[PDB]
Amino acid sequence: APGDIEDMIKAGIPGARVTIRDLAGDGDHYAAEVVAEAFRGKTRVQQHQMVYNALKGNMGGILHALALQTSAPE
Ligand SMILES: [Li+]
Ligand code: NI
């Protein structure tokens, strides 16, 4: 449902700030920016792993369907 991706990320990575856009308005492929203190000192691969973990396998095709940008807070 709408908002579920954001909800799952925030539940799984407490303190994260999330900005989700639905590419093409298609309800299928998305792009997300996730900013979290837990990301500081982690590589982008490690940060992305945390986001995949938070989705708990609920989003089929997540490798391509959730394009990610992650960072620690500024
Ligand atoms: Li989309
Ligand atoms: Ni797809």
Residue numbers in the entry: 4 to 77
What does the publication say?
S. meliloti possesses two BolA-like proteins (BolA and YrbA), the function of which is unknown. In the present study, we have performed a structure–function analysis of SmYrbA showing that it coordinates diverse divalent metal ions (Fe2+, Co2+, Ni2+, Cu2+ and Zn2+) using His32 and His67 residues, that are also used for Fe–S cluster binding in BolA–Grx heterodimers. It also possesses the capacity to form heterodimers with the sole monothiol glutaredoxin (SmGrx2) present in this species. It shows a winged helix-turn-helix motif formed by four helices and a three-stranded β-sheet (α1β1β2η2α3α3′β3 in which η: 310-helix).
Suitable X-ray diffracting crystals were obtained in a crystallization solution containing nickel chloride. Thus, a MAD experiment was attempted at the absorption edge of the nickel atom (Z = 28). We successfully phased the 0.98 Å resolution data with one Ni atom per monomer. This first structure was named SmYrbA-Ni. The calculated low solvent rate of 37% could explain the high diffraction power of the crystals of SmYrbA–Ni and SmYrbA–Cu complexes. The Co, Cu and Ni metal ions are coordinated in an octahedral geometry, bound to His32 and His67 of SmYrbA and four water molecules. In SmYrbA–Co and SmYrbA–Ni structures, the metal atom is almost equidistant from its ligands with a metal–ligand distance of 2.3 and 2.1 Å, respectively. All these residues belong to the [H/C]-loop, but both Asp and Leu residues are not or poorly conserved in YrbA/BolA proteins.
